[PDB]
């Protein structure tokens, strides 16, 4: 969190207007005279523009500063203009060259109208009593028939899933969802409270639909989950796989939530990676782990990062180091597409909400993916009462979300 | 428009058209309406429709459907907010239910034809012998958009051949805080860049 801070809390401000940008100091007394700034654009992550200009602003004043005719690409892909402010010397409580400040907007947007080029190759589909398999090529998924859900997946021989791929709506409850609510003094009004006594944390799934149909060039499959708890139905998980010619998932998910239950936490799927990688690469916002209601701090770019710090070590366990607005994101030979927001680490949820210490917690078998299509903000004002603004809670009754998973 | 793609496919009880279009001005791509209408024995599609906005053109004044029907039935009837005209930023006055009024009362007689007699909110619609379902804001007259568009006065508008429906899953604000600037405050404008919708149309 000290970073939304430190961000939030800077001295210069900045506006643009076209290719102009506005900058305002926030200094009372003092000249900028220890800053640079820096600024660069680019296409989805690659950089086509840098530029250095050293700031002349007074205190409480303005700077004007003409972006040099832009560049500008057919290829699709969002362009984003993000800016720096740099100390060139060092002070004394600063080395030379630390960002005091930064800024970032996104210019401009070509959409993809180009369609895929039609399979070469084609999905199989074996229909099994309890199972529908899909192969193709070295590739083959398993929806089990009687869970609805994709049980497992291989690459050539290898499986992938240790753990199925399922709906969630929960999580494990941070600081500001528990508040004081105690195990002998319960606070009902607690996120928590109010989510464990609904029985969302209990849900239990109920096969509705389960289907596959062969697509002219795809293999379609429809399924519908309602989770209940008292014969009270909270949500309502209606997807569709889409399996194509190049091997590839489409997700798209669409969910009710029945008015009168508490928000979820979030929205969105899980699974257990049968694997385990070093780096993390994602295209989204970050490095840092980022929140709803709050991720002012966090940067839209190519981020590449090492599992270790993927995971936040909040000394009393609870959900984590989530990023958000990922565009994409590859972890191994994973490959996953859309909107959302994400969270990877070596714990389940239950491993998080079961352990009141860090150092007690321990990597598990494989690789813990939750994928967001939504998720309720953190909220902070107090730790002690619901601190979380009513935009950043998921109030919409209806959801929807798309996915690409994909291999490499 | 321009037609990316459009495929009849064949299902165990259904059929599957598929459709995408990209909306340009001038080699830019506005948007993006990709769709799946799924017919079934029961004689009853599921449109469902999924648009992309480009992050660089002002937001859209609204994203749904739209077509002419024929039939040009007496009342209308609809299980949404009403029975008043209601707008996005202007909805706390209405009333979530059962309505069920003479078409006439569907348009809004301002003086300066605009878009009008909108009701969001809606579950259900009905007009003649069909019926349309899911989450949507509406309006029904007999007059294009076109026509309100192009018609300086109320008084110089003549009805159209049979009654245009505007089916949207979505709807900017209407603003009011001044009518000499931008009045649409944020929350109020389409500004997500994805939006997603289903419909289901049926006779009786």
Redesign the interface.
């Known amino acids: 969190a000290l970073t939304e801070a430190k961000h939030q809390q800077q001295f210069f401000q900045f506006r643009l207007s076209g290719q102009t940008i506005e900058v305002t100091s926030e200094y009372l007394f003092r000249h900028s005279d220890n800053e640079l700034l820096h600024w660069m654009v680019a296409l989805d992550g690659k950089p086509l523009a840098s530029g250095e200009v050293p700031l002349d602003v007074a205190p409480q004043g303005k700077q004007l500063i003409e972006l040099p005719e832009l560049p500008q690409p057919e290829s699709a892909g969002?362009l984003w203009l993000t800016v720096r402010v740099v100390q060139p010397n060092a002070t004394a409580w600063s080395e030379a060259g630390h960002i005091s400040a930064w800024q970032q907007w996104?210019?401009?947007?070509?959409?993809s109208?180009t369609?895929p080029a039609a399979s070469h190759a084609i999905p199989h589909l074996t229909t099994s009593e309890m199972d529908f398999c899909i192969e193709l090529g070295n590739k083959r998924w398993q929806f089990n028939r009687q869970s609805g859900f994709l049980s497992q997946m291989w690459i050539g021989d290898k499986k992938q899933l240790l753990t199925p791929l399922r709906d969630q709506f929960t999580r494990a409850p941070l600081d500001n969802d528990i508040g004081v609510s105690e195990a002998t003094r319960i606070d009902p009004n607690a996120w928590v409270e109010r989510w464990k006594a609904a029985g969302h944390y209990q849900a239990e799934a109920a096969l509705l639909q389960c289907?596959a149909?062969t697509?002219?060039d795809a293999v379609?499959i429809t399924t519908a989950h309602a989770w209940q708890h008292q014969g009270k139905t909270l949500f309502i998980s209606r997807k569709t796989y889409r399996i194509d010619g190049s091997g590839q998932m489409a997700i798209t998910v669409?969910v009710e939530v029945a008015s009168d239950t508490p928000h979820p936490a979030r929205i969105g799927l899980n699974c257990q990676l049968a694997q385990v990688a070093e780096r993390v690469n994602w295209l989204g916002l970050g490095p840092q782990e980022n929140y709803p209601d709050r991720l002012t701090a966090a940067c839209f770019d190519r981020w590449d990062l090492p599992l270790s710090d993927m995971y936040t070590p909040y000394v009393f366990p609870s959900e984590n180091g989530l990023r958000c607005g990922t565009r994409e994101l590859n972890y191994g030979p994973h490959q996953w597409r859309g909107?959302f927001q994400f969270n990877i680490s070596r714990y389940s949820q239950q491993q998080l909400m079961e352990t009141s210490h860090r150092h007690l917690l321990h990597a598990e078998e494989g690789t813990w993916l939750n994928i967001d299509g939504f998720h309720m903000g953190i909220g902070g004002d107090d730790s002690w009462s619901p601190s979380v603004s009513a935009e950043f809670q998921l109030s919409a009754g209806?959801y929807?979300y798309q996915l690409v998973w994909c291999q490499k």
């Open positions: 969002q996104r210019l401009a947007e070509n959409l109208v369609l289907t149909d697509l002219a379609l669409d909107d209806r929807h």
